[PDB]
Design a protein around this nucleic acid. Structure first.
Ligand SMILES: [Mg+2]
Ligand SMILES: [Mg+2]
Ligand SMILES: [Mg+2]
Ligand SMILES: [Mg+2]
Ligand SMILES: [Mg+2]
Ligand SMILES: [Mg+2]
Ligand SMILES: [Mg+2]
Ligand SMILES: [Mg+2]
Ligand SMILES: [Mg+2]
Ligand SMILES: [Mg+2]
Ligand SMILES: [Mg+2]
Ligand SMILES: [Mg+2]
Ligand SMILES: [Mg+2]
Ligand SMILES: [Mg+2]
Ligand SMILES: [Mg+2]
Ligand SMILES: [Mg+2]
Ligand SMILES: [Mg+2]
Ligand SMILES: [Mg+2]
Ligand SMILES: [Mg+2]
Ligand SMILES: [Mg+2]
Ligand SMILES: [Mg+2]
Ligand SMILES: [Mg+2]
Ligand SMILES: [Mg+2]
Ligand SMILES: [Mg+2]
Ligand SMILES: [Mg+2]
Ligand SMILES: [Mg+2]
Ligand SMILES: [Mg+2]
Ligand SMILES: [Mg+2]
Ligand SMILES: [Mg+2]
Ligand SMILES: [Mg+2]
Ligand SMILES: [Mg+2]
Ligand SMILES: [Mg+2]
Ligand SMILES: [Mg+2]
Ligand SMILES: [Mg+2]
Ligand SMILES: [Mg+2]
Ligand SMILES: [Mg+2]
Ligand SMILES: [Mg+2]
Ligand SMILES: [Mg+2]
Ligand SMILES: [Mg+2]
Ligand SMILES: [Mg+2]
Ligand SMILES: [Mg+2]
Ligand SMILES: [Mg+2]
Ligand SMILES: [Mg+2]
Ligand SMILES: [Mg+2]
Ligand SMILES: [Mg+2]
Lengths: 177, 208, 328, 132
RNA sequence: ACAGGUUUGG
RNA sequence: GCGGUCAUACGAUUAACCCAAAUUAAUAGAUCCACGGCGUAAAGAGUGUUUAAGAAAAAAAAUCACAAUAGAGUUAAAUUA
RNA sequence: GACCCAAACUGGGAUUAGAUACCCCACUAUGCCUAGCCCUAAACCCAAAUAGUUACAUAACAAAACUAUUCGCCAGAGUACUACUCGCAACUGCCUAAAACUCAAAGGACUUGGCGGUGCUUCACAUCCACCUAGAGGAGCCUGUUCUAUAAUCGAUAAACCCCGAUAGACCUUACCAACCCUUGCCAAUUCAGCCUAUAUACCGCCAUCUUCAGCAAACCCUAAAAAGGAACAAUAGUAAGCACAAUCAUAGCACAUAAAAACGUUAGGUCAAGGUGUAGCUUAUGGGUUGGAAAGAAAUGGGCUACAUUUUCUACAUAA
RNA sequence: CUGAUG
């Protein structure tokens, strides 16, 4: 993608190589933001349309106590929420994208609906993705099983640590008075 | 139409059921015919398990039946068979010993042979090509051949007879003529074959 | 509507006690077969549609399955698949896939250790098991369903049933199974009756085209028929009607082995011949073994003739023949 | 198109009663008759008298209770005494409702030379069955 | 020009 | 654009609006076209060269298989006297 | 000068109402060589030449949007590749090229329907053909229309009228006509009753047709704007109450079949004459009563019954006379 | 093949 040139290190005989210095520099901010929103009691939704790790993402969101969408994203889910989900529904406070493109190799619907609904979006972008609308892009690989598992475990430990430090802060809140 | 699509046709042949242990290919079919909860239609009043009836005679009687006078059609058929029997017996008793072994008195065999004799081989279909209908020679089916063979005889014996002559009296004569390959029904079949031979070159107009 | 149903259940219990009081039965043994029986008497509504009649049941059959609350007081949803639209169906699919992967890993480890202790527990033909229909799945999952997702769930259930089954997997796959009525069209055979020191006495009933025929058969007499007091030769002058009488007897080769007396009414000559044919065929089943009565029903003797004259329609001639339609 | 006893469907905002929401081909199937008598039997007589009396009761009650009648009347005829069941809106005070029922209970009796009963069931509003 | 009405089922 | 049977559009009445010793009509004026466009709406002229005239505002270049063109000679397939 | 072949024109032959066209045949100018003219093309890749850029940025479609130096053109549409000039071996020619007059439009692109004697797949189950049966159009009669004829109703009058309103006309019905009578004239009252007077192109009530077609549609949401559209199941922006369809119900058991049902709309479809009616018209009359007549067929036509026989006719009779 | 108009 044309918007991937600044996030690339080079080309190793046809295959583009993503640099890891900027990868880690973006991942630090992404993990900090997701940990802060999980600390402030924020709804976090792991979105990914990829028929290989959908079960891994559902199990990761279940172990995190956050919500997941790895299935066919309906049309008016985020925009027409008071008619798609229920009378009065609380929209997710963070959307984490484990695969930006769907099975048609086009940008996801939620990557535009979150920008339409003013919802922060963290997203793992490959060399063929479009990070223009993603709030926190992380230039990496989303097609290798260990690459997906590394990001899923990093976000798992981030949400776990955030909720645990929140419970500890409330424990001291109960002793301050 | 009151029968659903699941209703199957009944089997009247008693010999088909009397000896099932004589062949194994039929066993695998008749042991599962009833297992699938396959419903069977009611047997028609016209078709029964008698050995003195034939589907060809039943079809000819149904084609001769006007309106719904089936008793009248059956009377005409029985009187026709009796008339051909007596007309063959007269010639059996009037011929010598050499022709007695060649003359046939069984009415069913001569009826079937007359029908097979008037059965056409190929027919004509009107095909519209260039705004004009061409009579293309087409191979006929078995049911169409037998239906035409019966219909030609019935249509001839219904109109080309005198008012004083009765239906069985005319049909008995035309049956023997068709059995000996002399009747106008055989002439009509030959005319059909000659027209098909004259339009044999138009057989390329067919697409099936 | 969680509280409304709760109040309706209390009102229904009070109505049940009052109904048992006014009907005079013990309210303890008062069940639904007495509730509907008392409603049918107290409010005798004559209507053709059964759902329009007065009915008083427990509110859980009257009111449909209401969806439970999905989020707490703080707004956070309960289930982790709430933002998928179908949080029950997708959770069922997720559990099915999680058990499929568990069976896969356990069978891989068992093949690595070279042990085969599982069997084929998918063939449930003698039990008569089937899969759930879309309505049966829409009853379990309160939310609505579609066709493609139901076919995907069934195609995943067969994938799970095609693998070496575990212990807790069989009881999970069984709960989506339904047992199918009796797949047997075998008719009931009347036993041989003996009345007034008469041996081999049976009876049959037939009906075809507004013609009722009752035929009694004695298996000890000679071959002859007595209909309405007069013999069959004088009652059926036409050879076709007598051939209808010969049809069921010639099929069993019992021509000169049974005496029969029939009583036919209504219809015409061929309708009476077909009614007595069906009655004689249904009455001859007692004198014959089980293999030949099946050939009778496969030859068309034991089945009725539903071909009844259609009613003439207004504006037509013979219920099919239309009037002469003039184009201009 | 059939138009007898059929309220046409509007944009989806009109309130209709259970009797109006069903076509006339649903009588005795999903809904019943508004009147019950014996003149419409097989070997009975005096049917037209009951029809004209019923239509007079309808046209009389429509004017007697104006704007406050919820649905059509139920005219039961059982053993020389004729009962009229009505559904009335709570627009009139009971002081006037009792005056009206007491006036009609004797006017209809003296007009038809037969005992009449009049029963009123008052509803807060017209009961909606289909879309509203 | 601070512009408006006017082509067409639109 | 309105008038063929409820015309706020015609004629009259009531009422109302805007001007006002002026008000309308007609004709002249002032103003108004393009520092905009040229594939499909009007517009890239059928082609090349040159004169007049104009821009040279930072540096580079010129030329290669194949059916340009004009003459002279020849014919493999088909067809025909 | 050449001429194998093709072919304007032409002459025959087909088709057609006509065919001085498409189709077939023959043949000429011509296409061919030399020399001299003519200088026109949808001469279009409808995108000018020269050096560039991929910055800002999609009217629509199409070949994406643009810079700097220039040249040639463009001022509503028709008139008008026109008239009049100049020039040209062109003399039915080319180039350049107006005006009077008429109109408020002329145009380019697109959306949705409708249509297609356009391409391609799947179909027709009494339906198109391949095929079956019984009829109409021929005769007599019954009956309904169109016409002539009387003083003598009306409406329907393509599918969706024509034994239709009428499951029904000697008086009444009957609203038609000619003669005669009454005018607060059915009701408790009413400067009031009553009108079968006009308007079905004002209606309600009831129906016909597409139609056993499945679509109509409130509330939302999306589109680099939106006239409108909204789908990919290994799923790409769609959720959708409701009305239809379906299911159920009825033809006293199921199944089938039949019946019933069939939304929103099209035909300003039928009905002021079932009944009430908005508007416009009558009131000693377009209102209300009595008597008597409402023919007739020169003719055409629709639907039925009877037959035109031998599978017929008559008689007794269930069908063997 | 052919086959016009409102
Ligand atoms: Mg990738
Ligand atoms: Mg008939
Ligand atoms: Mg225009
Ligand atoms: Mg006026
Ligand atoms: Mg004006
Ligand atoms: Mg005026
Ligand atoms: Mg301009
Ligand atoms: Mg142009
Ligand atoms: Mg050019
Ligand atoms: Mg030019
Ligand atoms: Mg030369
Ligand atoms: Mg030569
Ligand atoms: Mg020549
Ligand atoms: Mg030639
Ligand atoms: Mg010619
Ligand atoms: Mg060219
Ligand atoms: Mg050009
Ligand atoms: Mg130039
Ligand atoms: Mg667009
Ligand atoms: Mg001009
Ligand atoms: Mg020119
Ligand atoms: Mg010129
Ligand atoms: Mg037909
Ligand atoms: Mg006839
Ligand atoms: Mg005739
Ligand atoms: Mg008339
Ligand atoms: Mg008329
Ligand atoms: Mg019509
Ligand atoms: Mg009179
Ligand atoms: Mg009269
Ligand atoms: Mg009058
Ligand atoms: Mg109309
Ligand atoms: Mg649908
Ligand atoms: Mg839309
Ligand atoms: Mg819906
Ligand atoms: Mg039933
Ligand atoms: Mg059905
Ligand atoms: Mg119907
Ligand atoms: Mg239905
Ligand atoms: Mg009209
Ligand atoms: Mg009319
Ligand atoms: Mg009227
Ligand atoms: Mg009228
Ligand atoms: Mg006539
Ligand atoms: Mg008719």
């Amino acid at each position: 993608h044309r918007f991937m040139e600044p996030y690339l290190f080079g080309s190793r005989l046809g295959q583009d190589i993503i640099d890891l210095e900027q990868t880690a520099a973006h991942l630090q901010l992404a993990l900090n933001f997701t940990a802060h929103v999980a600390y402030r009691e924020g709804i976090i939704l792991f979105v990914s349309r990829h028929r290989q790790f959908a079960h891994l993402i559902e199990t990761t969101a279940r172990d995190c106590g956050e919500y997941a969408h790895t299935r066919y994203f309906k049309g008016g889910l985020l925009t027409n929420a008071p008619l798609l989900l229920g009378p009065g529904v609380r929209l997710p406070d963070l959307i984490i994208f484990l695969h930006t493109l769907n099975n048609v190799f086009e940008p996801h619907v939620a990557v535009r609906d979150a920008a339409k609904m003013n919802i922060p979006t963290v997203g793992i972008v490959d060399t063929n993705c479009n990070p223009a609308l993603i709030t926190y892009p992380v230039p990496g690989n989303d097609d290798s099983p260990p690459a997906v598992r590394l990001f899923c475990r990093l976000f798992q430990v981030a949400i776990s640590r955030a909720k645990e430090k929140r419970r500890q802060v409330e424990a001291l809140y109960r002793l301050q008075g | 139409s009151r029968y659903g699509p699941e209703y199957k046709d009944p089997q009247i042949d008693k010999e088909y059921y009397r000896k099932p242990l004589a062949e194994q290919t039929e066993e695998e079919k008749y042991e599962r015919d009833f297992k699938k909860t396959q419903l069977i239609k009611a047997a028609p009043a016209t078709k029964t398990s008698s050995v003195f009836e034939d589907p060809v005679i039943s079809k000819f009687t149904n084609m001769m039946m006007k309106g719904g006078n089936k008793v009248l059609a059956r009377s005409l058929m029985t009187q026709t068979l009796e008339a051909v029997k007596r007309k063959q017996f007269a010639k059996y008793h009037a011929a010598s010993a050499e022709e007695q072994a060649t003359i046939e008195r069984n009415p069913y065999t001569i009826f079937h042979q007359a029908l097979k004799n008037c059965e056409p081989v190929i027919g004509l279909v009107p095909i519209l090509k260039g705004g004009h209908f061409y009579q293309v020679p087409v191979p006929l089916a078995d049911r169409r051949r037998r239906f035409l063979a019966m219909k030609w005889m019935i249509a001839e014996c219904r109109e080309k007879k005198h008012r004083r002559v009765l239906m069985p009296e005319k049909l008995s004569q035309e049956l023997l003529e068709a059995f000996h390959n002399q009747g106008p029904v055989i002439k009509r079949k030959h005319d059909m074959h000659k027209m098909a031979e004259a339009n044999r070159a138009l057989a390329h107009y067919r697409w099936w | 509507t969680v509280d409304f149903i709760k109040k309706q259940i209390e009102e229904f219990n009070i109505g049940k006690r009052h109904l048992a009081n006014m009907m005079g039965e013990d309210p303890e043994t008062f069940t639904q077969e007495d509730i509907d029986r008392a409603i049918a008497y107290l409010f005798p509504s004559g209507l053709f549609e059964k759902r329009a009649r007065p009915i008083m049941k427990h509110p859980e059959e009257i009111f449909p399955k209401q969806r439970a609350i999905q989020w707490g007081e703080d707004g956070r949803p309960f289930h982790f698949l709430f933002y998928t639209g179908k949080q029950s169906y997708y959770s069922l699919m997720h559990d099915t896939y999680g058990k499929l992967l568990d069976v896969e890993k356990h069978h891989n480890q068992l093949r690595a250790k070279d042990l085969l202790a599982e069997k084929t527990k998918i063939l449930k033909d003698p039990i008569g098991s089937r899969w759930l229909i879309k309505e049966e799945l829409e009853e379990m999952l309160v939310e609505k369903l579609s066709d493609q997702d139901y076919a995907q769930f069934i195609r995943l259930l067969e994938r799970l049933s095609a693998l070496p089954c575990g212990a807790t997997e069989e009881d999970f796959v069984n709960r989506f199974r339904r047992s199918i009525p009796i797949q047997s069209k075998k008719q009931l055979i009347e036993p041989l009756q003996y009345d007034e020191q008469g041996m081999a006495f049976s009876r049959g009933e037939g009906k075809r085209k507004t013609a009722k025929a009752e035929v009694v058969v004695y298996g000890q007499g000679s071959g002859r028929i007595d209909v309405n007091g007069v013999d069959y030769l004088l009652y059926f002058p036409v050879t076709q009607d007598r051939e209808q009488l010969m049809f069921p007897l010639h099929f069993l080769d019992r021509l000169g082995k049974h005496d029969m007396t029939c009583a036919v009414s209504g219809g015409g000559r061929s309708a009476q011949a077909g009614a007595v044919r069906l009655a004689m065929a249904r009455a001859l089943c007692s004198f014959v073994t089980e293999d030949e009565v099946e050939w009778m029903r496969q030859a068309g003797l034991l089945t009725a003739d539903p071909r009844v004259r259609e009613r003439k329609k207004p504006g037509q001639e013979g219920a099919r023949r239309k009037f002469t339609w003039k184009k201009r | 198109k059939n138009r007898a006893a059929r309220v046409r469907v509007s944009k989806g905002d009109k309130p209709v009663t259970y009797e109006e929401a069903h076509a006339p081909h649903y009588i005795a199937h999903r809904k019943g008759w508004l009147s019950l008598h014996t003149g419409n039997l097989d070997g009975e007589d005096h049917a037209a008298e009951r029809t004209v009396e019923d239509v007079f009761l309808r046209k009389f009650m429509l004017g007697t209770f104006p704007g406050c009648l919820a649905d059509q009347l139920v005219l039961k005829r059982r053993a020389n005494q004729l009962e009229i069941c009505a559904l009335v809106l709570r627009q009139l005070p009971p002081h006037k409702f009792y005056f009206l029922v007491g006036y009609s209970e004797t006017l209809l009796s003296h007009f038809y030379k037969c005992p009449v009963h009049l029963h009123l069931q008052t509803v807060p509003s017209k009961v909606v069955y289909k879309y509203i």
